[PDB]
Design a protein around this ligand. Structure first.
Ligand SMILES: *C(=O)[C@@H](C)O[C@@H]1[C@@H](NC(C)=O)[C@@H]2OC[C@@H](O2)[C@H]1O[C@@H]1O[C@H](CO)[C@@H](O)[C@H](O)[C@H]1NC(C)=O
Lengths: 327, 5
């Protein structure tokens, strides 16, 4: 039930506010894993864009031990988006022989971490030698920061290449487009959740895109949350929507490169909002796009789309797709 | 970039 989720989300944000202060509320996002434990006194933050791991505690007693468990637990947590609640403070059982972060972070030695002993020794180094302090205005927050390896993003994208490969054959969608979208949407974060309900690697909204893809595939209803936190399903669903936007919704755009710009913007903002930039009449809008150059279409969408997000999106996917195109 | 409801 969505209403139940909206309530708990409200409760979750409030519980953080009471302990940390309104100006210290950090919540999990599409590109940011954030997990609260210790009755909200301890939080772990993976920032996937910047490649940093920040572990913080505001516990008044034995701060270092709190950080230690959160450090170790984060370093060794298993890749399980389906199981963990990033909007609860409950301490999920997550330890794994192949941690999610394995190879994406190295310890003090330059070694990858897949077991408690190395994680534990690395936690001592960080506490002894990288411990920082700052204030709420009322309380001390203690933290350590870990920088991920320089190519942490390539390593993450490596997990999903096979899934992208298949999805690309299956629907006739370029591998480079698919990658550019998941990299821009989630930075290859399997735990990705947005404020607008986008779920997973390709950030799929269940009721709009997810529903529409289910129609083409001859289904009724909606993709479930658990279906979309499965990476291959998520990547298959997101790639289908790109094929659908191209073939059906934006099918009246003739120039394939113009249509690509329209499809990239639409993925994010909806096909109607993209067409409405040109006319309130969907056919007349496509006809107008058909009298323009692709560079002009690009220029119109990046400067005159209503949404600053969708506008920035077009630029960021287009730049990214270049890098994935060769191979 | 990061809730929810
Ligand atoms: C944060 O990095 C991004 C991914 O999230 C965006 C973002 N919007 C901003 C920064 O202006 C904000 O955070 C969650 C959502 O709003 C998200 O955008 C949503 O992205 C998906 C694409 O799968 C769209 O289908 C959603 O409709 C879109 N939200 C909108 C435009 O209502």
């Amino acid at each position: 039930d969505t209403n139940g989720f909206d309530i708990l989300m409200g409760q979750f944000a409030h519980n953080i506010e009471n302990i940390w202060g309104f100006k210290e509320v950090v919540i999990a996002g599409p590109k940011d894993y954030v997990k609260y434990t210790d009755q909200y006194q301890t939080r772990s933050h993976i920032n996937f864009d910047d490649g940093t791991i920040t572990i913080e505690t505001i516990a008044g007693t034995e701060p270092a031990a709190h950080l230690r468990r959160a450090i170790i637990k984060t370093l060794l947590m298993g890749d399980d988006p389906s199981s963990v609640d990033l909007y609860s403070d409950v301490d999920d059982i997550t330890i794994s022989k192949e941690p999610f972060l394995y190879g994406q972070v190295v310890d003090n030695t330059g070694q990858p971490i897949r077991w408690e002993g190395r994680a534990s020794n690395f936690a001592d180094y960080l506490l002894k030698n990288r411990l920082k302090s700052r204030s709420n205005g009322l309380r001390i927050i203690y933290s350590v920061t870990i920088n991920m390896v320089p190519n942490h993003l390539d390593k993450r994208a490596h997990k999903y290449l096979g899934m992208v490969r298949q999805a690309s054959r299956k629907y006739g969608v370029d591998e480079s487009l698919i990658l550019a979208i998941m990299q821009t949407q989630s930075s290859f974060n399997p735990y990705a959740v947005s404020r607008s309900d986008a779920l997973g690697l390709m950030q799929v909204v269940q009721h709009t895109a997810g529903k529409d893809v289910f129609r083409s595939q001859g289904k009724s209803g909606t993709p479930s949350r658990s279906f979309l936190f499965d990476p291959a399903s998520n990547i298959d669903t997101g790639t289908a929507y790109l094929a659908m936007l191209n073939n059906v919704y934006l099918g009246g755009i003739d120039n394939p490169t113009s249509r690509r710009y329209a499809v990239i913007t639409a993925y994010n903002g909806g096909a109607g909002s993209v067409l409405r930039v040109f006319s309130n009449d969907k056919i007349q809008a496509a006809n107008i796009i058909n009298t323009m150059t692709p560079g002009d279409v690009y220029q119109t969408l990046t400067t005159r789309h209503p949404s600053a997000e969708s506008r920035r999106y077009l630029y960021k996917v287009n730049t990214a797709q270049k890098s994935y195109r060769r191979r | 970039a990061x809730k929810x409801x």
